Assembly symmetry: D6
């Protein structure tokens, strides 16, 4: 909660990323390229190394156990917005780490990158996640209908946002 | 209204595209690269010629006057969704062409590309456009707060959608 | 047709090809890449110029009017098979060129390329085309269910074939 | 439940190549014929970002390699693909086939969101034809002299199944 | 209103090069010094997709080329850039400068959404310093022997203006 | 062997190939490029890895001793022909592997690759080899005069062939 | 004497392609099959420095294009090549063939210094076989079902002639 | 320290550089490209190896402990100026190395590179650093307003300079 | 000059440059590569377009007649020195342009490029040229023995220099 | 004889070179690559433009008629030697130009390039050429046996040389 | 003498080649590029691996001691000629191996490569080498004057040749 | 005799770089300034086939690295080059300099066949000037404020020697 730190994703963390994907078992993307294998992930990482439109970070504890991933995509440097997500590894879920990770992502987004707005998508069928985000200051701005094909059907997601002025002021 | 046809954007239409951009006077993008000049537009067109994540079309009348542009971006072939917009050239605005263009874009999206969902953004301060889209069967799914910096301030947009099942059935 | 001739597609014929696509108004492919514009067609033609897995030909009359296109795709040089299609330009449809063009494509396929089998797909909802192909010696070997998304719905197609031995013994 | 599906990786190419020499017919990678491990490896590297074919390896709980699930000719507008499954000789006849087929359909219809999957089966392997029918595939073609296999042209059934049948048949 | 700003294009490079030979100091494109039209042209092509510098040409109603608006050192995290304006000798002293400066600020603050714009002006050109002050720029530095210009090191004022001042000063 | 098996040539077999060349001591070729060294062989293998006009295979016994090489070159996928050759390692010559290797090459050529014709060249001055090939079903179709410069003089070779239809009906 | 041989150039490719569509069999350039002028042109550019095949055009005094002389499979150790000649339909039967053949042998044996030239002729064209025999070629093979031509496998004679015969037969 | 030495940055020092970045926890740049990861740092080092517009050096003690980094950027070879910065590793801060490192950077700048002017930026809200630089001979030439977004707000920096003639005459 | 102007060499001036070379009839160099033909000159111009180690300028009169060439080579941006030469077109030799051109080159070198020193080589056997340079403020600093092979023998050259401080204080 | 000048071969002179080759009707080489066609000549010229191992020059009269070619090959800058030849166009043969061309080649070789030795090959069956070279100061240093296959047989050539010290002193 | 075999030069033999060069202490060439270092030799070997204009071979004894080098350069496949040399390592000189090496080079040249003529250069100041070559059937065809700068002065070489018809018949 | 000269190789670059940090002035490779081992290594690879500069390392009988012999600005028409020698600090003052200089002249004049070698020496190092004079070099220039070294512009002697003097002085 204090002992959780954020650091830039590196090539040796791609195994972790790929293990997070196998566990979630939906289609993953790197700069909009779908991938399933570690090999393609590795190559996409190398190919987009200088692209600033997406940024990834790993959260570790004091003993360097890998806790989760913080990802910003669709980063636009004129409108100053990005989409984010966090993924916590299954073994570390439900330990109360989520809030800390979310705060670390906002801190980076609003005190380093100088973004104006961050938004995220949450499955309407995960009301507890929606609630958590609301408790961290995110507000619903959309209920996107049949937005994503997940587990054999089109599902709705809340689009939730928070502004730099709310987070900092 | 019958005499308006849609055709694939070609290299000779980039002048038209660039004239549409100067008139609207906000930042334009090609596969997420911002551009201002015809030269950069031309080079981006050549570079992304085989990329299927965005598709553009020009609407012409019977005498080949250029009426406007139909653009799909963020095309995802797993979720089967895209973002669209239409831009009508200033001299052809207010002639009642908008509805026809919108129908041509939906027709392409849902009878050729086989998309599931199309969505678009409309400035909350253009309620007449919002109404028009509603009349063509689009439904509001989001009111995105301070989404875009336009004319010196952050503005809200409606996110409006329509599904293939509604359009076809 | 007697003076319909077949010739190898060239770069100056791509305009014709692209006009054939706009008229039929379904998604077209070049070596499996979908394309909509002349520019992308041109670039794909240049990129695949040395690829032998698809071969295209243009049919002209004695005054060099462009009648249509003969296309072989999915050419496999071990099993000696290919998929064929034809597109006749709108203005030349229904004039009785189709059978002649089909025979020219079979002739090339079976007397020059030395293929064993040619097959084609025809919309089940175009029974008169199916009949025509049957009259040219093709036989139904499948009725592919919801095979293609065409004009806003999944459509069935007949798969029809003919063998080299049948064509060469007629 | 014991059997899991995972994306093919470069270290699995040996397995793939061993499966090919056992079956002893001409193999293809993105339509290029190959016979050697070295050419397989090169084709794997060259087409790594191509989404028109996707391959997966099925392993048991101890990571024995059971077989291969392959989708080719994937078209994202018609939303169709051709599938096949190859089980390693030592694992044939243990009743793994139906589980592998279900894993391939699940991926095809719940992740890739395809509409139709089809496959080819030798008309001279009626037991395979039957198996596929039991997994919900239906014959849509009997292709005549389609493939030169073992010194003669052979017929294959073309069999298919639709997303709506796989996902909603029980509703 | 007569004066419009448009993105620099390849056909404007002649104009740019003529502006350089008139001013007769060393010119740069993405930090590469150049003296010839040919090198200018090559640098234009090479950096076409670089967003760290942006250039615009100002024309009148009859498309006479009036001048150049240039942003360099554009940083999209700090949201700052360096600006300059060059008016063609024949159009100097016609009162175009303030209009051009407003067009550059408008683009910088209403389209690019930058936070801060700054510029350098020769301390030995007090009338230019005054002009910039009248357009709302404020001195934040007097850089000592910053640039070797015409055979000696000269001082420049660094002047700035913020987005909030430009957009909201009248509110 | 009965347990002679054929497998696709791989990069780790190039040493064997190069040892076969030094032993025969004539100029060797890879896709028509002459080579003498292991290094050039290796580079040519890498360069032509995707070329289907030549195919090579190594024959091994049950304990993976390397017996020889089967090579198809000049493969033409329209006329459906190829030139074949065999090289048996010196230590395995005269043990009665040759006929088995020849049958394995024909089997691959006619049951997998679906070729129509295989032909080979044999030195006219090695009449016992010519006889062997005749006993395996090859027939002389030419006696090529001063065809190859080999060991300091131009030598004649028989060109011998066999057809798919003959092999598959035996 | 009227007829001269000159190296094929890029402007002659149209002629070459017209010769191919007239003969209506599959043509090759460095073993790549081609059917179109565009692919011919690309193959010409790609193999420009390859010495394994050499082509020449025969013209009359007014630069009418008479035909093509082609050497392929040129091997500079065995000192052999395969030859063919194609005369344009309008110039066939004018008695040019023997002159062209002599020009090809002259080049092959007095400039390239080859040892052996051979050619293939359809066994069903006995008059061509005779012509070649009259120019000093000798049958060394009757290749059985060598080429699929016009819907069936056909036999060809392989005919040859040696440098020593061509140069010294009269000595 | 007397035995603090300056040496050219090498690829094996990038780990140190990256550890210095994580500790300071602001956005770092290499030839104007922002980077956060070791991997991107490494790639930018390789890409700009021949670029002379920035030069970097590592300061070590007699036992080769890494003390800090000296960086010159925006080097202009006509006006003969550069921007300098220093980063001292956390464990070596406050030990009285800073002034020695500054003098080593000035020495290199003015006795080897032959620059005319060096300038640097210091946070206005770190007045003790400003004072230190003044004691080393730097003079304030600007107070740049809201120059940098650092830790969630725009901050002012002093721009401080010193000339070759001053340093070489001290 | 009074209306002699200096402008950056461009690609359309290479013909002039090449005509200057044929007239002087010694081996010419571009970034140390010897060249004799227009074509090689053109290719070297394209290849070194971004190289700052040599800079060239053309001198024109008011009607744009081409008078000559000013060349700086071996430009070193640390020691701040360069080698200069001038070539006047034959038809404009002896008209009293030389001194004006020399002053234009020095002006550029010392007021724009901010160099410290310019030096040049002059044939010892052209004492009137040596004198001219001395009158323009250059001083002999060496007499290089058998420095250059020119017209069939090794020739001596004076090396002459002038410093920025001298030029800017005149 | 005074009015004949030497200039560096250029791309527009390749037609002339190729016409000289068709007339001589033996195998020609460019940096050891055999060529027969103008197209291959052109490409070899472009490819070896920066190679200093061979140098070519054209001799023209006052009206820019092309008289012939001066070629140096096998140029070695350590031993300071090269092989030369001259070819005069058929229409200009026998006008007494040969001597002038030879002197221009020696002048270039020994006063510009600073070579030590130049040598050339002359067919033993062209004794008048051999004599001419001897009159220009070349000396026989070899009678190379069956050196070149020319017109259907191996022929002998004289190798003739001259040194810079002889030419200049 | 029977136990000496010839094999194609490989990359692992470049050390040997480079040691032979340091010992002879004159300028060495690879496809006409001068080189002094092992690194440049290695790179030239890689660059010209497919070039057939020069061919090299190593002579080994039964225990694979490296005896020497056989080199053919200037190989012309129309005239069917090449220049050769042999270099024996200092420790193996004067053991009577020279004759065997020369015969192996001729055998390769005339029974495998099918050349017509081989020639070599021998320093006029090494009359014993000249004699040896004469004993192996080579004949003097030239005495090249001041041909090579060696040890600080220009030296003469005999050019010696032998024909395929002499060697084989 | 103990001291031998050999071509610089990639494994000697560490030595070269150590010689540079000891001398503590700006070093160059084919006119590119460098300070790091990594840039040195890259420049070595990039210019490996460039003959305009040549470097050699001098070793003793036990392969201790003594120093470096460098020729730059090598021009093969004028037949000149610039030379320098750097002896490692630990081997200075052992009397190796003259031997190294003779080895450099020997290579320059007996292998490369150059006409003239010249070098630059600090006018403030009169003992080096003397040494070079004793090895037969003659002053041909006193270059004024030629190099900025240790914070000021310094003069250098330019010294030369000709091939004919080195080879024939004793004749
Ligand atoms: Ca992928
Ligand atoms: Ca841009
Ligand atoms: Ca293959
Ligand atoms: Ca420049
Ligand atoms: Ca082809
Ligand atoms: Ca050639
Ligand atoms: Ca070299
Ligand atoms: Ca550098």
């Amino acid at each position: 909660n204090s002992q959780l730190t954020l650091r830039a994703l590196e090539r040796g963390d791609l195994r972790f990323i790929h293990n997070l994907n196998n566990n979630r078992n939906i289609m993953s993307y790197w700069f909009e390229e779908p991938y399933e294998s570690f090999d393609e992930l590795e190559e996409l990482y190398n190919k987009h190394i200088h692209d600033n439109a997406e940024r990834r970070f790993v959260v570790e504890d004091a003993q360097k156990n890998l806790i989760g991933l913080v990802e910003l995509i669709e980063i636009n440097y004129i409108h100053r917005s990005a989409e984010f997500q966090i993924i916590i590894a299954p073994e570390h879920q439900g330990k109360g780490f989520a809030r800390t990770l979310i705060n670390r992502a906002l801190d980076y987004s609003f005190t380093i990158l100088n973004l104006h707005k961050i938004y995220l998508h949450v499955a309407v069928e995960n009301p507890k996640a929606v609630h958590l985000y609301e408790e961290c200051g995110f507000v619903e701005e959309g209920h996107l209908v049949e937005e994503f094909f997940i587990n054999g059907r089109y599902q709705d997601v809340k689009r939730m946002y928070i502004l730099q002025s709310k987070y900092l002021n």
